[PDB]
Amino acid sequence: LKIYGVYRSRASRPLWLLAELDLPFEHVPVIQANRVAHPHGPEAPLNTASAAYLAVNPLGQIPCLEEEGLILTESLAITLHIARTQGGQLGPRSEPEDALMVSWSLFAATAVEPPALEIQLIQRSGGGTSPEGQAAIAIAAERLRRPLARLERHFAAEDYLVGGRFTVADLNLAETLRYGQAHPALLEPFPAVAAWLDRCQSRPAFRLMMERRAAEGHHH
Amino acid sequence: LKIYGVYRSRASRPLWLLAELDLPFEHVPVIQANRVAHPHEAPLNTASAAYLAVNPLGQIPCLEEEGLILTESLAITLHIARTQGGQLGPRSEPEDALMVSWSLFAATAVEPPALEIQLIQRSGGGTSPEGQAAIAIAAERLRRPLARLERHFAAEDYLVGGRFTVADLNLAETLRYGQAHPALLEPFPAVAAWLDRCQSRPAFRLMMERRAAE
Amino acid sequence: SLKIYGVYRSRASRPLWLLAELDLPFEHVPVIQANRVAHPHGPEAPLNTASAAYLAVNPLGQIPCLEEEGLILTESLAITLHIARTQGGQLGPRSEPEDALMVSWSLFAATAVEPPALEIQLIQRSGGGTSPEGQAAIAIAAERLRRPLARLERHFAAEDYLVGGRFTVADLNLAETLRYGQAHPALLEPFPAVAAWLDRCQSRPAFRLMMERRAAE
Amino acid sequence: SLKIYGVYRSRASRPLWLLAELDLPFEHVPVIQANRVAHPHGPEAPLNTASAAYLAVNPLGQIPCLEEEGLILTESLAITLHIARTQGGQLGPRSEPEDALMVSWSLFAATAVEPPALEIQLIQRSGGGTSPEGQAAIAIAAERLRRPLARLERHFAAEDYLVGGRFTVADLNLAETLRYGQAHPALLEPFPAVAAWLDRCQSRPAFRLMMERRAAEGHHHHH
Ligand SMILES: N[C@@H](CCC(=O)N[C@@H](CS)C(=O)NCC(=O)O)C(=O)O
Numbered sequence A: 001l002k003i004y005g006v007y008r009s010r011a012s013r014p015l016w017l018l019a020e021l022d023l024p025f026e027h028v029p030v031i032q033a034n035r036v037a038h039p040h041g042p043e044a045p046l047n048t049a050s051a052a053y054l055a056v057n058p059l060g061q062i063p064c065l066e067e068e069g070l071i072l073t074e075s076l077a078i079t080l081h082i083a084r085t086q087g088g089q090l091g092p093r094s095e096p097e098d099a100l101m102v103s104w105s106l107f108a109a110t111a112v113e114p115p116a117l118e119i120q121l122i123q124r125s126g127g128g129t130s131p132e133g134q135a136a137i138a139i140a141a142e143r144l145r146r147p148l149a150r151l152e153r154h155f156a157a158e159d160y161l162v163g164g165r166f167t168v169a170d171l172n173l174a175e176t177l178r179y180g181q182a183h184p185a186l187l188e189p190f191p192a193v194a195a196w197l198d199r200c201q202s203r204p205a206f207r208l209m210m211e212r213r214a215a216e217g218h219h220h
Numbered sequence B: 001l002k003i004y005g006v007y008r009s010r011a012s013r014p015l016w017l018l019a020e021l022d023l024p025f026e027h028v029p030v031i032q033a034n035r036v037a038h039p040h041e042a043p044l045n046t047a048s049a050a051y052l053a054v055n056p057l058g059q060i061p062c063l064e065e066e067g068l069i070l071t072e073s074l075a076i077t078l079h080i081a082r083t084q085g086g087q088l089g090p091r092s093e094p095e096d097a098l099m100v101s102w103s104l105f106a107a108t109a110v111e112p113p114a115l116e117i118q119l120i121q122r123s124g125g126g127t128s129p130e131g132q133a134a135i136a137i138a139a140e141r142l143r144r145p146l147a148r149l150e151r152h153f154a155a156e157d158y159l160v161g162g163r164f165t166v167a168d169l170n171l172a173e174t175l176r177y178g179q180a181h182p183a184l185l186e187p188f189p190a191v192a193a194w195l196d197r198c199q200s201r202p203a204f205r206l207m208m209e210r211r212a213a214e
Numbered sequence C: 001s002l003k004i005y006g007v008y009r010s011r012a013s014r015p016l017w018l019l020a021e022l023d024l025p026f027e028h029v030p031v032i033q034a035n036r037v038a039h040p041h042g043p044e045a046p047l048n049t050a051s052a053a054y055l056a057v058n059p060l061g062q063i064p065c066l067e068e069e070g071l072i073l074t075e076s077l078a079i080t081l082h083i084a085r086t087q088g089g090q091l092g093p094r095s096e097p098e099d100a101l102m103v104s105w106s107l108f109a110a111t112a113v114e115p116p117a118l119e120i121q122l123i124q125r126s127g128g129g130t131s132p133e134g135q136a137a138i139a140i141a142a143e144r145l146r147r148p149l150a151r152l153e154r155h156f157a158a159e160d161y162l163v164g165g166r167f168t169v170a171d172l173n174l175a176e177t178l179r180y181g182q183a184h185p186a187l188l189e190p191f192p193a194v195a196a197w198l199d200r201c202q203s204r205p206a207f208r209l210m211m212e213r214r215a216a217e
Numbered sequence D: 001s002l003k004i005y006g007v008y009r010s011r012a013s014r015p016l017w018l019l020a021e022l023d024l025p026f027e028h029v030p031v032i033q034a035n036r037v038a039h040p041h042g043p044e045a046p047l048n049t050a051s052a053a054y055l056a057v058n059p060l061g062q063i064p065c066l067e068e069e070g071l072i073l074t075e076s077l078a079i080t081l082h083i084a085r086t087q088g089g090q091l092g093p094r095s096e097p098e099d100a101l102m103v104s105w106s107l108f109a110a111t112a113v114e115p116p117a118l119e120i121q122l123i124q125r126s127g128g129g130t131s132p133e134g135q136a137a138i139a140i141a142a143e144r145l146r147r148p149l150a151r152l153e154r155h156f157a158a159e160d161y162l163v164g165g166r167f168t169v170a171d172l173n174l175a176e177t178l179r180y181g182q183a184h185p186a187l188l189e190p191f192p193a194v195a196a197w198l199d200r201c202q203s204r205p206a207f208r209l210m211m212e213r214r215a216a217e218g219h220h221h222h223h
């Protein structure tokens, strides 16, 4: 089992999951090409533009999973696969539970990640220091209103997405939401959602993943 | 087995699959609220309290089947294909994994740009010079994923297992959004050939005929 | 002397209307929008905004355009102001201050009114605006017009025209930019004073004459 | 007396720049955008676009606005032309034809350049390509500016200024609308003559001074 991608990327999803498990694996750090001066260079560290990596993931993105006879792209698919084959109770007990996890993951990828990622970039870019950046964050937050309200309703009676227990479905949704976490007002209207995200991030494996992510070298 | 949503929506994905499997089901034609003069009498729509009781998110499609309410068009198709799809579903966990992967790729890399092309074409200034420029830009967002598909289809006729599966169906539908753009697939003959293999299927034609009559 | 480029079914309608009001002799050179022509460069293609012969007059490739000896003037609202001011009649400014006012109202028309109104016409032009989705798109544009229209409502509740209490090129310019969204029936329902003003402008013989010729193309 | 409403950090920069060129005495009345004030109708709110007292001057609630004896004039580009014509000397029109050209160039600036350029400015202020929609919006705006810029490149291939071979309010007006998209990378790469023209207008002492004022503008509260 090999996982390609640095902690400071969507590879954080499968890395967090593996941290939840007592499973050895090979971590192949691959950096985003834009963070490397001469990515094509014969002496450049393995990155998303490296020919050697494109032979693994033709799309040139991280993360990517490679096992004996299987190459899998898409962070949320990678985690679901790992959870169902190596994750024990973090994986689905039945096909309907698996379907629910796939559904929550697609919900996370299509309804939550885009607007949340937008908030993250406005913030990191420094754009949030202008009235325009602030207005833009509010517009992105409005795109998240329906998804967040639906989640608030769900967490009114449940502590987790599926089966009354933390599963890869929570991990997957929590990671997409992490992008918009830096905006204080985002979860203010949604206490139950904030409590759930706090519940997921208080886990030892998350803290460990985040500490490893912090210790990772930065590249611009 | 109940499917909520009109043919003229993402419900077309599970509707196409149900046609492929010739499976009986109860179709509940919920329409997008923005297509109704006054959603709040009006036809059952995404803003109807009666529908929000089914899917609080207020979107179609939605599947309901003996103790299971499932949303997300691409998840519904995989679920139906795995439980009653035969060869259209996965033959192993790894195939299932690949199908889920291709679906997320379809939803995150293909659908957003493809949807933008459609939205521009149906807009007031869609056939204007600005419109044509916007579509070309939206189309550029698809170069990376399309080129990647071109490389895959250069060796295989289908996404998984060398046979048509719910994986191809899912991707094929996300791409249909930008199909109205004439030059979209000119640079990608392999993708065009694959898409034609999917849309030449009787079930696809049947779904589109039902969509036209709607 | 005066040559006006552009068909009636375009912004050339503004100077054409004014010329009808003034009854001034001029040469009307029919130039149609390229997108309305098949092979804009064919030997039998009509003179259009993409024609090399026209780009020689207006490099920007747009209509209308005014051409006098020693002056090529683009921008429909500038053309009307120039024609009216030089003719020196009551449709033009009586002083520099009235001229400034007319220029201001013209920029107001060009920036606050034309964009949203044009948007409404385009929506109607496409398959339809009558559809719930089209109506919603039109409502969005009508909302961009609320502040401008409300301000016009306040102005017309005290005056019958924009400047000097008389019909001038300023009224003509504004009326033409607002005509784009006029097809949406409800557009001026909340603004009775504006609708009354628009009626006074469109009731003029010269306006009706311009429209008749427009319908003929 | 001549009153100019609006802060430097707004389109009031247009008449303020012109006024700096002429060194003409006038009363600057600071009026800030309402979205920059917590409680625009509050007792301690600075005069703003939502203030009832300002709406009495300009019903549209926008800056800048000019007020002279018996004249209230809105629209930044009409304001500059009016000042130029009445007290600008050579910065104003020498004849009716020149005046017509200045009005025409101002309308071209307001309709062909300002909208797309502003779109670029707003997206840049918010962070740039912070989403697929943002990158696209910038690319669309840049494409909308292609014809206008190319038309300008042709004009500046033989002239150093828009009208009369000298700096006039026409240049000032167009330059301010283009300033919005100035930072976009390579926007003017294909248009060196346009770029040199903008540099020509912006290297003037009055422009630099206006920008210095714009950068330092603010209210002092003694504590
Ligand atoms: N939808 C994918 C997206 C993966 C992705 O875009 N990854 C980024 C880093 S978070 C990347 O590899 N970008 C660098 C590049 O495209 O060159 C997934 O969730 O796995």
Ligand SMILES: N[C@@H](CCC(=O)N[C@@H](CS)C(=O)NCC(=O)O)C(=O)O
Pocket: A106, A110, B008, B009, B010, B011, B032, B033, B034, B046, B047, B058, B059, B060, B061, B071, B072, B073, B074
């Ligand atoms: N990611 C979802 C999106 C579903 C969706 O956005 N559906 C649209 C119709 S195609 C809708 O119900 N919108 C109507 C509304 O929000 O009122 C899926 O793929 O199922």
Ligand SMILES: N[C@@H](CCC(=O)N[C@@H](CS)C(=O)NCC(=O)O)C(=O)O
Pocket: C009, C010, C011, C012, C033, C034, C035, C049, C050, C061, C062, C063, C064, C074, C075, C076, C077, D107, D111
């Ligand atoms: N702001 C200008 C705009 C002129 C304009 O865009 N005209 C259109 C016709 S109404 C045109 O010539 N477009 C055809 C083309 O660009 O090829 C004015 O008001 O004169």
Ligand SMILES: N[C@@H](CCC(=O)N[C@@H](CS)C(=O)NCC(=O)O)C(=O)O
Pocket: C111, D010, D011, D012, D033, D034, D035, D049, D050, D061, D062, D063, D064, D074, D075, D076, D077
């Ligand atoms: N077309 C006008 C537009 C003026 C305008 O929209 N100004 C902005 C500030 S640059 C404004 O006052 N908006 C703030 C508001 O409406 O509250 C002109 O050029 O004078």
